[PDB]
Amino acid sequence: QLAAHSDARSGPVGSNGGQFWSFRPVRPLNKIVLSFSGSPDQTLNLISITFSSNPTDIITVGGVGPEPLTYTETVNIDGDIIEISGMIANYKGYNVIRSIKFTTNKKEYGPYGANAGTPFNIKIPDGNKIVGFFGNSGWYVDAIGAYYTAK
Amino acid sequence: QLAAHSDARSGPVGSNGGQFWSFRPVRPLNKIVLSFSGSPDQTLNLISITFSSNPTDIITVGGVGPEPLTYTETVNIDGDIIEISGMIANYKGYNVIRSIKFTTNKKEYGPYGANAGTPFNIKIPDGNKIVGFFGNSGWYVDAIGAYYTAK
Amino acid sequence: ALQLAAHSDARSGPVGSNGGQFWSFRPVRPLNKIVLSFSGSPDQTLNLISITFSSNPTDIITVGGVGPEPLTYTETVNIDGDIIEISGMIANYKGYNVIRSIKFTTNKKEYGPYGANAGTPFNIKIPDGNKIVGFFGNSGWYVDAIGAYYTAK
């Protein structure tokens, strides 16, 4: 028997939330869907984030609550994610993730979401890429951290 | 800011494998699909396991390889998983998980798969239930461990 | 023979910021002593440099600055019960965002805060019915981040 390995982690950032969640697919996590209530002209409220690498490897964090989704944004990442960032602010009594941006060596995706709050940055040791995420969530996305491994 | 929490883990059991994977959905992980090559009368070879809690929260471990799937088994868990077990044996040069069984307080599901190999048992501290899994995988399922939290 | 999966404790945190090295200390027996070392003075401003955690003479960890230091201020905490909460403040020092203040809370007594009362506050609480049995974080010249290992009482 050869001992199995578990990827290093960066984070989480954010606050304690109802449930722990973790998603680290074998294949490149390359598609993210952000869902919000509200509207662009009257502030977008991040409710849930859906991460996937393909049709049968996907997770939805936050969005457990009844609040109807009004707006969705699909992001297709074509490269290796090396950092994510965003803002944290209160929403209906909880400190949640309100905006998020993803950064690869080539380009940047976002920020998506609200514009106010306290900033967070999840970076990883040089020579690595982000291959999964974990955090705390319930009706909203409370905390988030990333799994990383060598490029 | 209130520090986020991360669930305890039991395992992994098995051997090092190409890629680390992790799946801990917010909602009850209640459906498992086991896919095999071969056949019941000539030995079933576990190739991949698909875990899910609903249509948009699912992961497939193993099954990256070309080997065509010939047989699938769907298991619907209606309760709280407290333990899993199975056998580990060699398959085309790798020590992989060859059979698996899931045990709840009410009933047991399986074993499913081959019948030979060295046994493994993933149990958890009393008063807890399994809410996710993690492990190593590539073409096959190399290692597996579980995330647990209070019932 | 038989592989019977081993368990790892749940975690709360880390909070703070990325630091040089990752560190971890979860001893088998109860933590019962914490030594905080600072430059400066309480009459003025205390600069938290290192934290020494231990459960006994042969189970101890030192995180944060350990190199050369002249006359330093020390604070020794002797814990009696189960630590259930930790808090403090984070702020910048010599170019690094480090833990500047820290307070340890058990059901029996509250210890601290110790240090400089300025910066962003942090709080490490754990699920009811649990106890903190270890800590982990990042550290270099100072204490950059910290989190806690917990398990059921």
Place this chain on the structure above:
Amino acid sequence: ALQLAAHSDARSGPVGSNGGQFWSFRPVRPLNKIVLSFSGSPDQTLNLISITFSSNPTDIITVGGVGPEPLTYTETVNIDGDIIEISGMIANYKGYNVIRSIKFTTNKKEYGPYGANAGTPFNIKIPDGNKIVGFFGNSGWYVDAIGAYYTAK
């Protein structure tokens, strides 16, 4: 202010079996000393009771049996380089499936195996280009399970 996510090292293992308490020790500085304590005798059979890991006098952990023990056999290992691999054997002792043998390997030297050469073998290797900077596991009266924390050289 700003939350800059802290990093935690990758892990290899644990191997062995479930034990009483989870334990963890990842010191900032290089491990450089390991003390193994056994009942029995090398001329006969050595029963591994505890492992003491340390990087210096103020960074040490003791896992496994610590209670009363008469005359015990000791083995002190002084590590020089980066530990890259650990191995040993697991077998039953007084009703528990514990670590019975262990060997530590660095690029410069191999230390062990130490203990009883019987039972199921285990091997903790890490991804090429990395080094072991800590260990974790389960322990009680004996050493039940062990795994390693690793990071890039």
